[PDB]
Coordinates of C-alpha atoms and ligand atoms in Angstrom, one line a residue:
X3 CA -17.6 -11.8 -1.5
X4 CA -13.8 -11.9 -0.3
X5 CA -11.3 -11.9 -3.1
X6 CA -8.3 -14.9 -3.1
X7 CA -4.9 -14.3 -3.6
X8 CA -4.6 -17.3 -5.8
X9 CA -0.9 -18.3 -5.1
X10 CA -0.8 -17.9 -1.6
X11 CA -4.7 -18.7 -1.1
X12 CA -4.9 -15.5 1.3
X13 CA -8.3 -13.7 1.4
X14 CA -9.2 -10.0 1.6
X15 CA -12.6 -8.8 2.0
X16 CA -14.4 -7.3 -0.7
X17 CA -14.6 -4.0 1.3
X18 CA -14.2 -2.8 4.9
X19 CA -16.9 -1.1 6.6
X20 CA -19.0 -0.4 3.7
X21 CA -17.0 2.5 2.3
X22 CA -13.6 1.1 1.7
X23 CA -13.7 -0.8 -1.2
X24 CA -11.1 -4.1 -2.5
X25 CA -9.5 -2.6 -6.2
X26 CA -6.5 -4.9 -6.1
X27 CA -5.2 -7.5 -5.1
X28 CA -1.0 -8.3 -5.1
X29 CA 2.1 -10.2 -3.9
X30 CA 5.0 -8.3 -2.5
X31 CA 8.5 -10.4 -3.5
X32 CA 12.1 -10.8 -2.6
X33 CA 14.4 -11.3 -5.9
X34 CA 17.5 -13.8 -4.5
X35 CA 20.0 -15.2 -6.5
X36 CA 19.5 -16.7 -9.7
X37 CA 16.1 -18.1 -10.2
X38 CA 15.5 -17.8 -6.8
X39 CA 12.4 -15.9 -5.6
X40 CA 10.6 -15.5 -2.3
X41 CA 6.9 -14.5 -1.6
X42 CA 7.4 -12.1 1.4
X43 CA 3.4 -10.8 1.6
X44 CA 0.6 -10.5 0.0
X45 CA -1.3 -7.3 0.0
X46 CA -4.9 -5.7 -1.0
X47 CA -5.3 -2.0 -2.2
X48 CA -8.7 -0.4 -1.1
X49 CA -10.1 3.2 -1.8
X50 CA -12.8 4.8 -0.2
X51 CA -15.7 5.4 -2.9
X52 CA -17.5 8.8 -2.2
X53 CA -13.3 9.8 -2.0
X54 CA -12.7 8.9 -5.5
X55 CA -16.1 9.9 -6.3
X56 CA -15.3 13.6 -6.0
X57 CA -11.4 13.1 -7.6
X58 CA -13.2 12.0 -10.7
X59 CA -16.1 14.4 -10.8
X60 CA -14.0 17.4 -10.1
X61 CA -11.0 16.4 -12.2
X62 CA -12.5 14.1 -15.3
X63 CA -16.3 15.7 -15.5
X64 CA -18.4 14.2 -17.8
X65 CA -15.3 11.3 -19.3
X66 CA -15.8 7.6 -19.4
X67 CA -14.1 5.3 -17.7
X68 CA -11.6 4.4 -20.5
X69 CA -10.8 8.0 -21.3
X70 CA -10.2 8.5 -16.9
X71 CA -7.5 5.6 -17.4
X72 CA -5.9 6.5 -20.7
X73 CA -5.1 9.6 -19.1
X74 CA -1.6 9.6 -17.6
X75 CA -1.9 11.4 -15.3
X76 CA -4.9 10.0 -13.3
X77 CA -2.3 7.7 -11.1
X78 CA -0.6 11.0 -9.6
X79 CA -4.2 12.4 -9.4
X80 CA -5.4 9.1 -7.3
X81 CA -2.3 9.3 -5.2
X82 CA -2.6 13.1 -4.2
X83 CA -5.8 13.7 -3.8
X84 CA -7.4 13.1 -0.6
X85 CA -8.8 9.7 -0.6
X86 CA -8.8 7.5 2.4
X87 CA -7.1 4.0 1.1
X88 CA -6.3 0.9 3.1
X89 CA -3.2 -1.4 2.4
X90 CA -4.1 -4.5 4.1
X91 CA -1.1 -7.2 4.1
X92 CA -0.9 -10.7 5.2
X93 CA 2.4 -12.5 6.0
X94 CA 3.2 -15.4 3.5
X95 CA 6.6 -15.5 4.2
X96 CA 7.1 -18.0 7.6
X97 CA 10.7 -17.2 8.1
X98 CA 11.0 -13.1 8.6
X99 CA 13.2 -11.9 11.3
X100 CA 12.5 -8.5 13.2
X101 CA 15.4 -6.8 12.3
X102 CA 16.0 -7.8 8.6
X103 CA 12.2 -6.1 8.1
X104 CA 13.2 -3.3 9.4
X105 CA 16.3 -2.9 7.2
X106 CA 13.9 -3.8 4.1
X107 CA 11.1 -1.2 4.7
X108 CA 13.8 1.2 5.4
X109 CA 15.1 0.7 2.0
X110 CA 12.3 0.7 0.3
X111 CA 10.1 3.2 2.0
X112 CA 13.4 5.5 2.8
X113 CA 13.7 5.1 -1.3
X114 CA 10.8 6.9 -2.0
X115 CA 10.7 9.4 0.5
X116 CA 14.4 10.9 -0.9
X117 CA 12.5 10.4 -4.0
X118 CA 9.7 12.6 -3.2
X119 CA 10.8 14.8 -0.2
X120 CA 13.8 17.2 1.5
X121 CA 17.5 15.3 1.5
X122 CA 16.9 14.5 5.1
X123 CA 13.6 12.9 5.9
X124 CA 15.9 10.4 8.8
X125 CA 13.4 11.6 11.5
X126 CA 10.4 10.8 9.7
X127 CA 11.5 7.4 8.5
X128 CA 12.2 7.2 12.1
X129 CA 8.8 8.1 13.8
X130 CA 7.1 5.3 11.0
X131 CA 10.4 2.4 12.0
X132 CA 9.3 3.7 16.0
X133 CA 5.8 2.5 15.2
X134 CA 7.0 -1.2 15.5
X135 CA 9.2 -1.1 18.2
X136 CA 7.7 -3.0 20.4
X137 CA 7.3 -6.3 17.5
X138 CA 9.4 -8.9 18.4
X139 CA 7.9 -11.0 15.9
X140 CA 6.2 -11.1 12.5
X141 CA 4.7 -14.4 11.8
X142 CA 3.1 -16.0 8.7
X143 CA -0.3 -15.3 8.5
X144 CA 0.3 -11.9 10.5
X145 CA -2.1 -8.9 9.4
X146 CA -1.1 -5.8 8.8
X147 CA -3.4 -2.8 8.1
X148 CA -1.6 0.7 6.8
X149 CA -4.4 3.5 6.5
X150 CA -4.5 6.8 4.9
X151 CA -6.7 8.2 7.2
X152 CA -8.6 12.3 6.3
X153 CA -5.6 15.0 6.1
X154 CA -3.1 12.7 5.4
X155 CA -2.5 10.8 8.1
X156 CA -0.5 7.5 8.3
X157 CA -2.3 4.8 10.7
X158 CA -1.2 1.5 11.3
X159 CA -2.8 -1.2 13.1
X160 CA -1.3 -5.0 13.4
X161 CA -3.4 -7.9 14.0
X162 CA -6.2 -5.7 14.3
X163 CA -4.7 -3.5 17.1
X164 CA -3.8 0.4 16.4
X165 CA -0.3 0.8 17.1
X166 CA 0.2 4.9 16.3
X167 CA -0.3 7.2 13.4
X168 CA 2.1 9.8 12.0
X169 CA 0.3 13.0 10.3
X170 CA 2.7 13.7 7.2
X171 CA 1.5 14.0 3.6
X172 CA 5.3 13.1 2.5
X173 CA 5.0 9.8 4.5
X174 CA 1.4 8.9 2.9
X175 CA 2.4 9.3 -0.5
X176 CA 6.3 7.4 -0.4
X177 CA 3.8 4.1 1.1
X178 CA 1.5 4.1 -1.5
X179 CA 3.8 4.9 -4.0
X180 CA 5.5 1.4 -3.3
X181 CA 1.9 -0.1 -3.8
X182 CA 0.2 1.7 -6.9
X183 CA 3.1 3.7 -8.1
X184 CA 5.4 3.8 -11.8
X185 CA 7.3 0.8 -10.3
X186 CA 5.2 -0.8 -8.0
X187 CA 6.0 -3.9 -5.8
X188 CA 3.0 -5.9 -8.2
X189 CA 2.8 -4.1 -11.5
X190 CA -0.7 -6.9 -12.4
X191 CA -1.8 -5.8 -8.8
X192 CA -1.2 -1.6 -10.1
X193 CA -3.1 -2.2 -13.2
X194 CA -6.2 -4.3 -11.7
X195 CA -6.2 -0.8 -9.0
X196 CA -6.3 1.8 -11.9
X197 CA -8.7 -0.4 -14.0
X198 CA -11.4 -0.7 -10.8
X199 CA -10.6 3.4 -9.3
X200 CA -11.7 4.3 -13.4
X201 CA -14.9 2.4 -12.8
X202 CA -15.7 3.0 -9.2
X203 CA -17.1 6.6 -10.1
X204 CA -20.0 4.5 -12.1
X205 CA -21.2 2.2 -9.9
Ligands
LIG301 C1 6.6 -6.4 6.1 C2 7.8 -5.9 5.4 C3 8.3 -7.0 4.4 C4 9.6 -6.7 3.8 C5 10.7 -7.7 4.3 C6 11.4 -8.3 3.1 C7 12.8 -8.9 3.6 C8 13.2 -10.1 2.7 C9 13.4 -11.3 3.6 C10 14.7 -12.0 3.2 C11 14.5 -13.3 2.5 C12 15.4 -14.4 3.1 O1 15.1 -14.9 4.1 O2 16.5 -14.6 2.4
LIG302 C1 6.9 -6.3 12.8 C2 5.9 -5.6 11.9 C3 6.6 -5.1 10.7 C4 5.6 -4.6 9.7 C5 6.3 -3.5 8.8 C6 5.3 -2.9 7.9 C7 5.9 -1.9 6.9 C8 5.1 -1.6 5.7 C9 6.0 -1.2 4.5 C10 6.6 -2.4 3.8 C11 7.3 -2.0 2.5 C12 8.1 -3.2 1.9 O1 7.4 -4.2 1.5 O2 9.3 -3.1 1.9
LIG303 K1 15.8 -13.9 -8.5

């Protein structure tokens, strides 16, 4: 049964195509001035199960679930490892323009790839920005998948249409970092995703 974002009232399937399954669910904000706050998206995280599966069995043999998430270092684990994980998001926001989106996921995704890769990473920020170049628009209510698809390879699709894919590891693990990461965009939504990738492995 689809899970609701309760504040915005957006849905995301409980899983996509059998495999991929809903771990959490999260809202992605814009601090203004003051006590002034924006909801830009909501977004769901999802993980494929055999995937995380194997992580745990090869890396946390024989540990319970409590013991997989009191370690700290089974977020890095998640995040390298190759598990196939879906960022769905869903436009909340009704007022976005084009080009200050592009400016914002610059920022934030050009953030974390100085953060994680070589001092020069322009022309791989630019083959992801290049994957929207032909959006003149981006609606409320707009959907946005971002996949990690085998090998480490980046594919996006937007209102259910594949727009391109960029094979870099560096790439796949700045994106997710923003998502389930030490300062992620929804720390509840971060939490929820560590708590269900523990118990995943059990079911
Ligand atoms: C899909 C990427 C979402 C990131 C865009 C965030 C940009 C914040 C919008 C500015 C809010 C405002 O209109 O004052
Ligand atoms: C016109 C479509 C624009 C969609 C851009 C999707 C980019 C995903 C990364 C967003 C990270 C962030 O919230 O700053
Ligand atoms: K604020």
């Amino acid at each position: 049964e689809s899970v609701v974002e309760p504040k915005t009232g957006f849905s995301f399937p409980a899983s996509i195509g059998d495999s991929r399954r809903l771990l959490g669910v999260g809202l992605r904000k814009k601090s203004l001035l003051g006590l002034k706050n924006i909801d830009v998206y909501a977004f769901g995280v999802y993980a494929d199960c055999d995937d995380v599966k194997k992580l745990v069995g090869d890396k946390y043999a024989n540990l319970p679930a409590s013991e997989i998430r009191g370690n700290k270092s089974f977020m890095d684990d998640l995040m390298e490892a190759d598990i196939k994980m879906t960022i769905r998001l869903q436009i909340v926001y009704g007022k976005l323009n084009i080009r200050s989106v592009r400016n914002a996921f610059q920022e934030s995704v050009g953030n974390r790839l100085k953060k994680f890769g070589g001092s020069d990473n322009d022309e791989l920020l630019q083959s992801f920005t290049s994957l929207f170049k032909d959006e003149y628009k981006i609606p409320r209510n707009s959907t946005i998948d971002l996949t990690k698809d085998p090998g480490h390879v980046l594919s996006v699709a937007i209102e259910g249409n594949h727009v391109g894919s960029v094979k870099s590891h560096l790439l796949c693990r700045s994106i997710l970092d923003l998502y389930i990461g030490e300062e992620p965009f929804d720390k509840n939504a971060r939490e929820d995703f560590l708590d269900n990738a523990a118990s995943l492995a059990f079911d």
